[PDB]
Design a protein around this ligand. Structure first.
Ligand SMILES: Nc1ncnc2c1ncn2[C@@H]1O[C@H](COP(=O)(O)OP(=O)(O)O)[C@@H](O)[C@H]1O
Ligand SMILES: [Mg+2]
Lengths: 557, 28
């Protein structure tokens, strides 16, 4: 392989490449713009060790105390029906609502799976609201507490617009502790310093700072209680041991234990109370977009390379000429039930066909007669197109041309010429017609034709009748050229029967559909039946940047 | 055209020195 080929392949598949990469980048944009932002707050603690303090900070006792203090077991979620409603609502700048709830008790269904009772509260105004558990609709009002049907509830300070809905869950205490723990991190950053960095991430920029402050306060107030206690145990013992110099000695010791109890400041000190970084730490938009674009490019390039290594069709006449097959022409796609050589006589395809005509005028000398047979390997390769247009172009030069549609199975030439469908080729071959009622005139052409006629049940066996050769011998004395259109050779054997009487035979190979293998097989199958194929005609060519085989398929005039 | 960036420095003596770095960069 070389660089020019791969550059050409990318240029040719640019449409697919752009489409795939743009779709991937669009999904990356959507995700990076709709994912819920995550803020992070931190605090700094000084230790007057530091290995067990990490484990004590993340203990269930301290976190549980924080949860009990701040009621983290009442979970409130603004309701958006889709997995994108929250993100879009944020994008339009809509302010999310919040509700203060200070007392909650659900009936605690507690089935096998759903251990977490929940309700839905719809806000109706600044004061009242509707509550539904499983369709049980109730009305409540801010202020007054509610106890109905085994639900106790107290709501304060609704801050939202009417019509909003909120999911309210009363999750178990241990679940709340686990949720708090998974978002809470502690590090040492010095491996010897009394420095601990506490970090907490969450979706609410203020709630996380409040939670981290509460955690720090609980830990600190717990720590000093430890030091105060052992002094307090000593102070209690001395007081219990009180029964005069020793009497004064214990009193002075008691005061020293009293002052040591009150001077609490000890091993733990709060350097920095928690604050929240206003820039969310997730999602990291730029890296998301870069990964999206790179992924799009990689998958597109792999897909293109895949398609290149699985492509097998013919691409240039050089492929056919390596095997030893003469390519007499290359016809491009005509982007333009009428003969092309009549509707648009200046088309590029008709120019290529004129080139083919001049090639034939030299190839068909020293042919045993003036009969030309066009065939092909696979159906819808262009045999009828080529044959009909070639007949038209040869006819406009003042030579008498006869076009025979010997495709007794799917021939539609009569439709494309304007027809009297009676008395086709079938009726002549079967013996129920003469040679004169079958020949018809093309209107916009200038040549005669013979249509197939009625589809017979035994096409291949009809073509073996000697009346066919009689017809060819008779017509070869009244016309300058006879063109015969035939079915494919890989499908049926009609072409190989007809080719016995044809002076010249050509194959039509469709540009990207057929492969070299079919063409070689077709040539060999024609040879085995005693038919010598002059050469091939490549049809349906389009411009490929990767080709480096380059035609005269451009307008000149 | 880039704006020039000057640098200033000072020297401090600790009579350690691992936690003092974290104290200096603290928010207080
Ligand atoms: N180079 C071409 N440009 C435009 N249309 C073409 C070209 N080659 C074939 N066709 C059209 O595609 C269809 C298939 O060709 P056709 O000759 O009818 O099939 P077959 O070769 O099996 O007889 C036809 O409608 C034909 O008009
Ligand atoms: Mg055909």
């Amino acid at each position: 392989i070389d660089l020019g080929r791969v550059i050409g392949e990318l240029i040719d598949h640019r449409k697919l490449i752009i489409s795939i990469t743009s779709v991937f980048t669009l999904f990356a944009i959507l995700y990076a713009l709709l994912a819920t932002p995550i803020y992070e707050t931190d605090a700094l603690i000084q230790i007057e060790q530091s290995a067990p303090e990490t484990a004590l900070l993340q203990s269930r006792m301290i976190l549980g105390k924080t949860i009990d203090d701040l009621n983290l077991q009442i979970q409130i979620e603004q309701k958006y029906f889709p997995v994108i409603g929250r993100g879009l609502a944020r994008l339009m700048g809509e302010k999310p609502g919040n509700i203060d709830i200070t007392r909650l008790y659900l009936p605690d269904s507690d089935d096998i799976s759903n251990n977490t009772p929940s309700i839905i509260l719809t806000v109706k105004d600044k004061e009242n609201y509707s509550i539904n558990s499983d369709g049980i609709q109730l009305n409540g009002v801010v202020g007054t507490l509610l106890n109905e049907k085994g639900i106790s509830l107290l709501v304060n300070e609704i801050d939202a617009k009417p019509g909003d809905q909120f999911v309210i869950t009363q999750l178990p205490r241990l679940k709340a502790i686990s949720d708090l723990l998974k978002s809470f991190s502690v590090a040492d950053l010095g491996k010897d310093t009394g420095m601990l960095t506490l970090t907490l991430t969450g979706d609410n920029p203020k709630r996380i700072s409040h939670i981290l402050d509460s955690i720090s306060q609980n830990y600190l107030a717990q720590n000093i209680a430890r030091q105060a206690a052992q002094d307090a145990k000593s102070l209690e013992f001395l007081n219990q041991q009180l029964p005069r110099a020793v009497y004064l000695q214990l009193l002075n010791r008691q005061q020293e234990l009293n002052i040591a109890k009150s001077s609490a400041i000890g091993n733990v000190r709060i350097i920095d109370n928690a604050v929240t970084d206003p820039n969310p730490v997730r999602p990291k938009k730029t890296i998301i977009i870069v990964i999206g674009v790179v992924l799009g490019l990689i998958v597109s390039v792999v897909l293109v390379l895949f398609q290149v290594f699985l492509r097998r069709g013919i691409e240039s006449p050089e492929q056919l000429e390596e095997i030893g097959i003469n390519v007499y022409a290359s016809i491009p796609i005509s982007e333009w039930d009428t003969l092309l050589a009549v509707g648009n006589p200046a088309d590029l395809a008709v120019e290529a066909i004129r080139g083919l005509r001049t090639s034939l005028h030299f190839a068909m000398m020293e042919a045993k007669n003036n009969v030309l047979m066009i065939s092909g390997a696979s159906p819808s390769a262009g045999m009828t197109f080529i044959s009909s247009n070639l007949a038209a172009t040869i006819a406009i030069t003042g030579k008498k041309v006869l076009f025979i549609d010997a495709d007794l199975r799917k021939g539609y030439a009569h439709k494309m010429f304007g027809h009297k469908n009676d008395k086709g080729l079938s009726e002549f071959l079967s013996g129920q017609a003469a040679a004169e009622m079958i020949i018809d005139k093309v209107e916009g052409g200038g040549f005669d034709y013979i249509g197939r006629g009625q589809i017979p049940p035994n096409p291949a066996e009809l073509l073996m009748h000697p009346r066919f050769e009689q017809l060819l011998n008779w017509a070869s004395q009244n016309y300058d050229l006879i063109i015969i259109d035939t079915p494919p050779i890989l499908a049926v054997t009609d072409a190989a029967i007809i080719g016995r009487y044809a002076g010249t035979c050509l194959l039509v190979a469709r540009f990207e559909k057929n492969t070299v293998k079919e063409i070689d097989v077709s040539m060999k199958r024609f040879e085995q039946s005693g038919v010598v194929v002059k050469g091939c005609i490549l049809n349906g060519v389009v411009k490929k940047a990767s080709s480096y085989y380059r035609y005269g398929h451009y307008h000149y005039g």
